[PDB]
């Protein structure tokens, strides 16, 4: 499965997993402080990922700066 | 499954998931504030995605803005 | 499955799904207003997609405008 | 399955599906007026596609102008 | 399955499908007027395609004219 | 399955299918007149193809003339 | 399965595995001192990886520093 | 299955199929006169191909001139 | 399965295999003298590899030193 | 299965097939005259090929002469 | 399965196979004298390979000199 | 399966097959005299290949000499 790389560029960045299925809700919010990184897959339970806060992101489709 | 990357360039960008199957209706609306990102897959339940609001988008076919 | 990216360049763009199978009818018309984007897969129920109105389109085979 | 992209360059363009199987006949004719686009797959029921009228076409093998 | 793109450069171009199997005979003749295009697959029933008339052809191996 | 493209450069070109199996015989001879094109697969019944006469040939391994 | 390469650029770097499944908790924290490298897969039990501390990271999508 | 392209550059070229299996013998010799082409697969019954006489050959590994 | 190449640049480089599964602990420590190389796979039993000591490392994602 | 192309540059080039399995012995010797070519697969019965005599050889790894 | 190429650059080079499984031990040491080459796969029984002594090594990830 | 190409550059080159399995012994030594070529697969019975004597070797990972 595909994954995304998220580096926080400030404190309090939020990486949020949305549930896979007919129901869509937030199931987890991971806090990243400045400089911390989360490398997160799409999975059986996560089919969309939301990022709140200033972050540098890499995916297969390129960079978000 | 393929995914799309949506960066909101204004508050209130709406990412709308349309139901897979014989019938087509929206099943989820996810709102993004300016600078927020949604990385969203096509899934068993979502076979089309509509984006309303000023956004920067990446897919396998490149950039749409 | 393949997907197409359609950005409306004017109000009232229509993205129309044609039924997969022996019969061919329109099963859904998605109206896009100017600047809205639809990212739509080919699916069990949709084997052809018609676009009416001024639009910018990306597929695996390139850009249409 | 492969698909083709057809943009009408004049009114009254006709995209015609030919039946898959031992029998070959037209099963559907889709009319495109100037500037309209059809993105159409090969399918269980369609193994050849005929285009009548002035059109710009993209397939995996390139462009017809 | 592979497909071929045939653009007629004169009226009456004939695209001829030859039967798959131990026996070989034509099972279908599709005529194209000048400027018309046929996009045709190899299939369960068609294992060779003959083109008669002045035409521009694309296949996986490139252009034949 | 692989296919070959044969364009006759003179009248009376012969494209001959050889039988797949322990035995090898000619099962079909397709006559091409000048400018005609045959696009022919390897198949359950054809494992070698012989061409007699002046022709332009494309395969996956390049051009023969 | 995909893997990530993490080189600690200071003492006390923490590479944290998050549990695969409906629930998300930290199941392991691997402490890296300066110059140590961890090469870690995504696995049945780990579907997201968090990195705290100054580190140089390689994944399939590029370098993070 | 792989195939080879053989063009005779003189009369009396011989393309010979060797039997697949524990037994190795010639099962077929196809005569090519100057300019004639044989496009021949490896098959259930042919696991080596011998060419006698002046010929131009293409395979996946390049050209023999 | 992927593998990593580790060249020790000093005596006593430690290549440490971490257990695949719900639990994480080291199951093997392999020491390398200066100039020695270990080429090590990810496996049923090893889902993360830790390297301690000055080393030159190659993986699919490039060089880490 | 892979194949090799062997062009003899002298009379009496010997292409020798070695048996697949626990035991290794030659099971077939095919002789080539100057200019003759053998295109030979690896097979159920042949897992190594020895060439004796001056020859030009192509394989997936390039040219050996 | 992947393989590695090891050329000894001095006498007494040691290529050592480590056992696949929960248990890790040396199961074989192959001695290479100057200029000798071992081409060795990863296998059911070998999931890590250790090289002692001055050697030139090629793997899919590049060269160790 | 992968294969290697070995050209002897002197008389008495030895290409030695090592047994696949828990045990490792030499099961075959193929002597090559100067200029002879052996093209040898990895197989059910051979999981490592040793070369003694001056030789030119090609594998998927490049050339050894
Ligand atoms: N529960 C939704 C989540 C989702 C994925 N992609 C989306 C795009 C738009 C809206 C919601 C989604 C699903 O699995 O389909
Ligand atoms: N329910 C439709 C949604 C859809 C996907 N692609 C489309 C293209 C056009 C219109 C609707 C659609 C389907 O699954 O097929
Ligand atoms: N119902 C048709 C729709 C279609 C797909 N491709 C086409 C091309 C031409 C005409 C119709 C079509 C089918 O599934 O086959
Ligand atoms: N019914 C035919 C349609 C067709 C496909 N490709 C063709 C080429 C030539 C003529 C007819 C065809 C088939 O499925 O085989
Ligand atoms: N009936 C033949 C048609 C054919 C395909 N390729 C050919 C090449 C030569 C002659 C005939 C053919 C077959 O299926 O095999
Ligand atoms: N009947 C033969 C035809 C053939 C294919 N490739 C060949 C090469 C040489 C001679 C004959 C052949 C076969 O199926 O194997
Ligand atoms: N338990 C979650 C962990 C996870 C993976 N990717 C994520 C993205 C965001 C939040 C949590 C996650 C899962 O397996 O799905
Ligand atoms: N009957 C042999 C033919 C063959 C293929 N490749 C070869 C190489 C050398 C000698 C004989 C062969 C086989 O199937 O294995
Ligand atoms: N036992 C863990 C080991 C592991 C792999 N990748 C990791 C990343 C972070 C922490 C631990 C790990 C697992 O198999 O999942
Ligand atoms: N009978 C041996 C032949 C062989 C293949 N590759 C080799 C390399 C070295 C020595 C012998 C071989 C086998 O099938 O395994
Ligand atoms: N027995 C171990 C050997 C091993 C492979 N890769 C490793 C990395 C580090 C330590 C040991 C290993 C295993 O199969 O998993
Ligand atoms: N019998 C061993 C042979 C072997 C393969 N690769 C090796 C590397 C090192 C030592 C021995 C080997 C095996 O099949 O695994």
Minimum Cα–Cα distance from J7: chain H residue? H64
Ligand 3 pocket test, pick from D18, D41, D51 with the greatest ligand atom count within 8 Å of Cβ, gives D41
Pair G48, G23: CB distance under 8 Å? no
Report how many helices (DSSP H) and strands (DSSP E) chain I contains, helices first: 0, 7
**Which 8-state DSSP code applies to residue A25?**
-
Chain E residues in contact with D24 (beta carbon < 8 A)? 17, 27-28, 30
Terminal Cα-to-Cα distance of chain K (whole angstroms)? 23
Of E31, E40, E42, E41, the closest CA to residue E8 belongs to E31
Please indicate whether residue E4, judged by its CB atom, sits closer than 6 Å to ligand 4: no
Pair F54, F18: CB distance under 8 Å? no
CA distance K56 to D30: 65
CA distance C29 to C15: 6
CA angle L41, L47, L50 (to 5 degrees): 80
Give just the sign of the alpha carbon dihedral J49, L47, K50, K29.
Answer: negative
Please indicate whether residue D46, judged by its CB atom, sits closer than 6 Å to ligand 3: yes
Structure tokens given for B32 = 């993004």
Give just the sign of the alpha carbon dihedral B60, C1, C2, C4.
Answer: negative
> How does E34-64 read in b/e, with b if 16+ C-beta sit within 10 Å?
ebbbbbbbbbebbbbbbbbbebebbbebeeb
Give just the sign of the alpha carbon dihedral B39, B44, B45, B49.
Answer: positive
Residue nearest to atom 11 of ligand 6 (CA): H17
Distance of CA L56 to the CA centre of its chain: 11
Residues 6+ apart with CB under 8 A from B4: A61, B39, B40, B49, B57, B58, B59, C39
Distance of CA F40 to the CA centre of its chain: 7
Pair B13, B53: CB distance under 8 Å? yes
> How does C12-42 read in b/e, with b if 16+ C-beta sit within 10 Å?
ebbbbbbbbeeebeeebebebeebbbbbbbb
**Which 8-state DSSP code applies to residue G10?**
S
Task: Calculate the dihedral angle through the C-alpha atoms of C38, C44, C45, C51, rounding to the nearest 10 degrees.
Answer: 40
Residue H13 has a CB neighbour count (10 Å cut-off) of 21
H/E element holding J42? Answer: none
Q: Could you tell me which residues of chain D have a Cβ less than 8 Å from any Cβ in chain E?
A: 2, 4, 18, 20-22, 24, 42, 47-55, 57, 59-62, 64
**Residue L41, burial from CB neighbour count under 10 angstroms (0-12, 13-18, 19+):** buried
Chain H residues in contact with J30 (beta carbon < 8 A)? 18, 24, 48, 50
Pair J22, J47: CB distance under 8 Å? no
Sheet of strand C3-8: strand arrangement: B26-32, B13-19, B46-52, C37-41, C3-8, C55-59, C62-64
Q: What is the DSSP string of E25-45?
A: -EEEEEEE-TT-EEEEE--SS
**Residue H31, burial from CB neighbour count under 10 angstroms (0-12, 13-18, 19+):** middle
Pair F1, F54: CB distance under 8 Å? no
CA distance C48 to C33: 21
Strand pairing class (F13-19; F26-32)? antiparallel
Task: Kindly list the distances between the CA atom of residue G45 and the CA atoms of C12, G5, G26, in Å, as whole numbers in the listed order.
Answer: 48, 18, 11
**Which 8-state DSSP code applies to residue L45?**
S
Pair C29, C46: CB distance under 8 Å? no
Longest alpha-carbon distance in chain E = 35
The answer for E35, left when phi > 0, alpha when psi is -120 to 50, beta otherwise, is left
CA distance J33 to H34: 20
- Side-chain half-sphere CA neighbours of K42 within 13 A: 20
Q: What is the DSSP string of D1-65?
A: --EEEEEESSTTEEEEEEEPSS---EEEEEEE-TT-EEEEE--SSEEEEEEESSEEEEETTEEE-
CA angle H48, H53, H57 (to 5 degrees): 60
User: Domain D1-65 maps to which CATH number in 1.10.3720.10, 2.60.40.50, 1.10.10.10, 3.30.465.10?
Assistant: 2.60.40.50
> How does D5-37 read in b/e, with b if 16+ C-beta sit within 10 Å?
bbbbeeeebbbbbbbbeeebeebbebebeebbb
Q: How far is the CA of F31 from the centre of ligand 5 (A)?
A: 13
Task: Kindly list the distances between the CA atom of residue G47 and the CA atoms of A15, A19, G1, G24, G53, in Å, as whole numbers in the listed order.
Answer: 14, 14, 11, 9, 20
Structure tokens given for G47 = 């579907």
CA distance D64 to D15: 14
Residue I55 has a CB neighbour count (10 Å cut-off) of 23
**Which 8-state DSSP code applies to residue G25?**
-
Chains contacting chain J through 3 or more C-beta pairs under 8 A: H, L
Chain F residues in contact with H60 (beta carbon < 8 A)? 60-61
Domain residue spans of chain K: 1-65
Instruction: Provide the shortest C-alpha distance from residue K36 to chain I (in Å).
Output: 17
DSSP E strand boundaries for H1-65 = 3-8, 13-19, 26-32, 37-41, 46-52, 55-59, 62-64
CA distance E60 to E57: 10
Longest alpha-carbon distance in chain G = 35
DSSP E strand boundaries for C1-65 = 3-8, 13-19, 26-32, 37-41, 46-52, 55-59, 62-64
Q: What are phi and psi of B8, to 5 degrees?
A: -70, 135
Pair C37, C29: CB distance under 8 Å? no
Chain G residues in contact with I22 (beta carbon < 8 A)? 27, 45
CA distance H3 to D56: 36
Pair H8, H48: CB distance under 8 Å? no
CA distance I52 to I37: 14
**Which 8-state DSSP code applies to residue H20?**
P
Sheet of strand I37-41: strand arrangement: I62-64, I55-59, I3-8, I37-41, K46-52, K13-19, K26-32
Ligand 12 pocket test, pick from K25, K41, K42, K52 with the greatest ligand atom count within 8 Å of Cβ, gives K41
Residues 6+ apart with CB under 8 A from D28: C24, D16, D17
CA distance F45 to E23: 9
Whether residue E37 and residue D62 make contact (CB cut-off 8 A), yes or no, is no
CA distance B25 to B41: 17
Chain G to chain I, count of Cβ pairs less than 8 Å apart?
63
Tokens 């309303």 -> residue = B52
Please indicate whether residue H24, judged by its CB atom, sits closer than 6 Å to ligand 8: yes
Beta bridge partners of K55: K8
> How does J10-28 read in b/e, with b if 16+ C-beta sit within 10 Å?
eeebbbbbbbbeeebeeeb
Q: What is the 3-state composition of chain K as percent helix, strand, coil, each rounded to the nearest 5?
A: 0, 60, 40
**Residue D4, burial from CB neighbour count under 10 angstroms (0-12, 13-18, 19+):** buried
Give just the sign of the alpha carbon dihedral D20, D5, D55, D36.
Answer: positive
Candidates A17, A21, A39, A64: best to mutate against G (most CBs of G within 10 A) is A39
CA distance C44 to C59: 19
CA distance A53 to B35: 7
Report how many helices (DSSP H) and strands (DSSP E) chain L contains, helices first: 0, 7
Q: Could you tell me which residues of chain H have a Cβ less than 8 Å from any Cβ in chain J?
A: 2, 4, 18, 20-22, 24, 42, 47-55, 57, 59-62, 64
Longest alpha-carbon distance in chain C = 35
The answer for F12, left when phi > 0, alpha when psi is -120 to 50, beta otherwise, is left
Q: What is the 3-state composition of chain B as percent helix, strand, coil, each rounded to the nearest 5?
A: 0, 60, 40
Experimental method: X-ray
Residues 6+ apart with CB under 8 A from E23: none
């Amino acid at each position: 499965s595909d994954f995304v790389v998220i580096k926080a560029l400030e404190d309090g960045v939020n990486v949020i997993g949305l549930t896979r299925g007919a129901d869509t809700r937030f199931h987890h919010s991971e806090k990243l402080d400045k400089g911390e990184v989360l490398i997160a897959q799409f999975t059986e339970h996560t089919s969309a990922i939301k990022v709140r806060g200033k972050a540098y992101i890499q995916t297969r489709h390129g960079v978000i700066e």
